[PDB]
């Protein structure tokens, strides 16, 4: 089956990886941008958007990190397919 294959594992791993990287202060999020030197500094947030998450994780945060992790997983699976590893 697909659910449980290498592609699905890699994709969920990449998506949850970016999500847990943004949630636990290891990746740039809505509330924390970066400078030229990649140091996490806060943001204006340009609207203000609420969230019940203790850290402040938002629906925008999950959309952004889902898109990034989906790009990462797509690229990884099609690369491993490209070098014959998959």
């Amino acid at each position: 089956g697909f659910i449980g294959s290498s592609t699905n594992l890699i994709m969920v791993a990449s998506t949850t990886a970016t999500l847990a990287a943004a949630r636990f202060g290891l990746a740039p999020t809505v509330k924390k941008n970066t400078t030229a030197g990649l140091k996490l500094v806060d943001s204006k947030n340009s609207a203000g958007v609420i969230s019940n998450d203790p850290a402040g994780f938002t629906i925008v945060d999950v959309l952004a990190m889902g898109a990034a992790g989906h790009g990462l997983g797509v690229g990884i699976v099609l690369g491993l397919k490209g070098i014959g590893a998959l």
């Binding site: 697909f2 592609t7 994709m11 740039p28 999020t29 809505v30 509330k31 941008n33 943001s43 204006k44 947030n45 340009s46 609207a47 203000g48 958007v49 925008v60 952004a64 898109a67 790009g71 797509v74 699976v77 099609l78 397919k81």
Partner: protein, 312 residues
């Protein structure tokens, strides 16, 4: 919120009162002509909007609606070319024999001897051999009928009227403020995702579903009258899965990232089609899919209302 819609309701009244007064846009020419140089200055300063006034908001509104008028005119011109390819062309004759018949879409009236300009182009036709390449573009789109050109012309006229209505609206009824035009982050994000990203994606969809099968059958010697219509290639997946067996798999290979299954209509052939002398439409389809993805990820770069992104 910072990046938002910000307009003024009914800034400029819609009346021909300023049509009857030439030179109204400037302080010097509104007094009237005394010399003929006024007549030339009236035209040289007509679109010099940044000298009619100092406020960038009114200049910007003028520019926006003027762009809308230019778009409406371009749509008129495009609809006219499609219409001339529908009524006054040898297109349906050219599709059957494009190597022999000369593309013509402009017929001349026989008034003062200029019927000699209605040359023997081919396909039992007499007209001016056009060099704009609309016939090749239409074959590459998968037209194969003058009725589709006719309705494309009518759609172009509809869109032209829409653009002119839009210019009138965005000047006289609801004109945006300066802080709307000044959201260049949003303008770039949108013109990259939706305009050039989603535009290339939609054109890729057309190239997948209409151009590729129609042109594949055209290159296989099939007569343009017996080719399935594009909507029949949309609904009946059997035809496409006969032409490209990866359509039997559906859109699953996309969502399962088994994209190589799509290698029947998304190719990297390169070179030219030996039978038409043009690029492979599968190559162009994959091209537009790719640059659509590229532009859609490029349109998520700048920061508009949610802190992610860049400040230019």
């Amino acid at each position: 919120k910072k990046v938002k819609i910000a307009v003024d309701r009914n800034p400029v009244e819609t009346s021909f009162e300023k049509w009857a007064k030439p030179g109204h846009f400037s302080r010097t020419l509104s007094k009237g002509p005394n010399t003929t140089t006024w007549i030339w200055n009236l035209h040289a300063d007509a679109h010099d909007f940044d000298s009619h006034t100092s406020d960038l908001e009114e200049i910007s509104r003028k520019v926006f609606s003027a762009h809308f008028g230019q778009l409406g005119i371009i749509f008129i011109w495009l609809s006219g070319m499609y219409f001339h390819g529908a009524r006054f062309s040898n297109y349906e004759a050219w599709l059957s024999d494009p190597t022999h018949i000369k593309p013509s879409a402009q017929v001349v009236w026989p008034i003062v001897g200029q019927e000699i300009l209605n040359g023997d182009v081919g396909g039992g036709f007499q007209g001016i051999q056009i060099t704009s390449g609309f016939f090749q573009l239409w074959r590459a789109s998968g037209i194969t009928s003058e009725l589709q050109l006719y309705t494309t012309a009518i759609g172009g006229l509809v869109m032209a009227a829409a653009m002119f209505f839009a210019g009138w609206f965005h000047y006289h009824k609801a004109a945006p403020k300066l802080e709307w035009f000044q959201n260049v982050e949003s303008m770039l994000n949108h013109h990259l995702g939706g305009l050039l990203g989603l535009g290339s994606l939609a054109w890729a969809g057309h190239q997948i579903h209409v151009s590729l099968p129609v042109n594949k059958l055209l290159d296989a010697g099939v007569d343009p009258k017996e080719i399935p219509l594009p909507h029949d290639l949309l609904l009946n997946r059997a035809i496409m899965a006969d032409l490209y067996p990866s359509f039997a798999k559906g859109i699953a290979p996309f969502f399962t990232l088994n994209w190589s299954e799509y290698s029947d209509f998304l190719t990297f052939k390169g070179g030219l089609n030996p039978v038409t002398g043009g690029l492979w439409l599968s190559d162009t389809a994959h091209h537009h899919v790719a640059i659509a993805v590229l532009f859609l990820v490029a349109g998520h770069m700048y920061r508009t209302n949610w802190g992610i992104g860049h400040s230019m």
